[PDB]
């Protein structure tokens, strides 16, 4: 009795809502991102005795930063040369090197240069993947995507790379983290904590698996949707890194062709004898990791065997491991890696896998726009840490399930990293009762 209304300010309660998120930058940069925004130092506090539901499928900031990655790529690629006048008819014979069938463009053509008087004859070096065959005589050839879109050369000195990015909350909005180790991608966390901004998430572009990423806390974690057994993509997050060594062994000769102030870059000549580019895997780490992954996956599926095959059909972005290293894009044969089976009941030896490289790459989510990678001189070596897998499943039948790699959609790769965070809106104006009146 004798209760009256009172109001309170600074109330600790929140709702869940969409918002626009702020981003951070780095001191050193390539030089919209190169000097902006700010580069703060974050801190973290633990929300004791707080339980909150999380869901890595429904959360919105993944799509937000997907749009941000697209917009940054477009703004970076906007002040660049358009390669339209290269769409003329190519006459290729391709017999200059010791072996020709590997690369198969070595292609003469006419180009206007610096006078607009009359086109002059030039020749360059190209890969047969980027070359398509015109009708009639086989020696006639065309560029691959010019029947569909315009092709832009990337300027080499503004090259974009996985710079770590921190996502800052705006004022009045809080970010929740769920520091629990065995979080399953959905459900209630009882280990809630808050930050001002996230850690250094890198824009990693890869297919069939992901790399240069974070690592799990306990053992290997499996994240998947649970609306139905019919799933698009299942994420596997490793607790232990495996090392990959990639190499393009040959040196290349960059040559420049002048088109106004632009200067088109092409390949002149490969130095020395031709060797095919390849990657290397520690065999014991790979097969032990596969055994651990399969014997952990059979928790979900009770009595059926587990068997792996490589993917079938589609473009090269899903049949092969594709990624970027340096300035060069690699497509790696993964047939030998995924040939295992298991019944349902430290660095010895090395698997080598063959690769192919191509210069004209479509946008990694979309067709109707393509970009031309510039040639990179010299031999290229790379070392990376693979942190997880993106898998899909077949139907199969009784006694046997089947899992094969996939993951052509680039958004699920960033969904594999931003599973922790969630954005909430603060509602600090909770009312209350009290045993007190107001002065009259």
């Amino acid at each position, epitope marked *: 009795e004798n209760l009256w209304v009172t109001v309170y300010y600074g109330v600790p309660v929140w709702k869940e809502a969409k918002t626009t998120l702020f981003c951070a930058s780095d001191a050193k940069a390539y030089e919209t991102h190169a000097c902006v925004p700010t580069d703060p130092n974050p801190q973290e506090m633990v929300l004791k005795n707080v339980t909150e539901n999380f869901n890595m*499928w429904k959360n919105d900031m993944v799509d937000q930063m997907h749009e941000d990655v697209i917009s940054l790529w477009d703004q970076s690629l906007k002040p660049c040369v358009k390669l339209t006048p290269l769409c003329v008819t190519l006459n290729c014979t391709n017999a200059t090197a010791s072996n020709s069938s590997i690369i198969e463009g070595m292609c003469s053509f006419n180009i206007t240069t610096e006078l607009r008087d009359k086109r002059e004859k030039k020749n360059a070096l190209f890969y047969k993947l980027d070359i398509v065959q015109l009708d009639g005589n086989s020696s006639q050839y065309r560029l691959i995507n010019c*029947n*569909t879109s315009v092709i832009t050369q990337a300027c080499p000195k503004v090259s974009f790379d996985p710079i770590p990015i921190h996502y800052c909350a705006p004022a009045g909005y809080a970010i929740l983290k769920c520091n629990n180790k065995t979080f399953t991608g959905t459900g209630p966390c009882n280990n809630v904590s808050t930050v001002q901004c996230t850690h250094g998430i890198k824009p990693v572009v890869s297919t069939q698996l992901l790399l240069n990423g974070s690592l799990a806390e306990g053992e290997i974690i499996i994240r*998947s*949707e649970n*609306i*139905t057994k*019919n*799933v*698009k*993509t299942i994420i596997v997050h490793l607790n232990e890194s495996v090392k990959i060594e990639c190499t393009r062994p040959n040196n290349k000769t960059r040559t420049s062709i002048r088109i106004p102030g632009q200067w088109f870059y092409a390949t002149g000549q490969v130095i020395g004898d031709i060797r095919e580019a390849y990657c290397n895997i520690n065999e014991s780490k790979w097969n032990e990791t596969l055994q651990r992954v399969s014997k952990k996956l059979k928790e979900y599926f009770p009595h059926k065997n587990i068997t792996f095959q490589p*993917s*079938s*059909g*589609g*473009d090269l*972005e*899903i049949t092969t491991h594709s990624f970027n290293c340096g300035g060069e894009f690699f497509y790696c044969n993964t047939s030998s890696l995924f040939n295992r089976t298991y019944m349902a009941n430290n660095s010895t030896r090395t698997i080598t896998i063959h690769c192919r490289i191509k210069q004209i790459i479509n946008m990694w989510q*979309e*067709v*109707g726009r393509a970009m031309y990678a510039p040639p990179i001189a010299g031999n290229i070596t790379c070392i990376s840490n693979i942190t997880g897998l993106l898998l*899909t499943r*077949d*139907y*199969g*039948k009784n006694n046997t399930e089947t899992f094969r790699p*996939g993951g*052509g*959609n680039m*958004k699920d790769n960033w*969904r594999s990293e931003l599973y922790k965070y969630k954005v909430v809106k603060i509602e600090p104006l909770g009312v209350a009762p009290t045993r007190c009146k107001r002065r009259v």
Partner: nanobody
Amino acid sequence: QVRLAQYGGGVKRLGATMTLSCVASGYTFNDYYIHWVRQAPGQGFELLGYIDPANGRPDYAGALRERLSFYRDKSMETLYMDLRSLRYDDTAMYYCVRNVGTAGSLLHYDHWG
């Protein structure tokens, strides 16, 4: 608004390889999966397989992995079946269907061609 036109069909000779084509018209072509369903006379429907038009990823039924083939062209947004080695039991009404799906899972079918 959305339409799924189909071309090819009629009579095909025994033992040959046959091709069906579909054209989608009024929606974002990369967003929705496409399934291929058929109905023999005197029998219920059954699924042959499905295709992702974005990356060209197929998936096939267990009994027909060797005879089927799906692919697509993204610029003319056109989808193609190839079926090899036709047999007499393949007499059927064939449809493409668009599939509605979430970010992680697939759901009911909306439209039939």
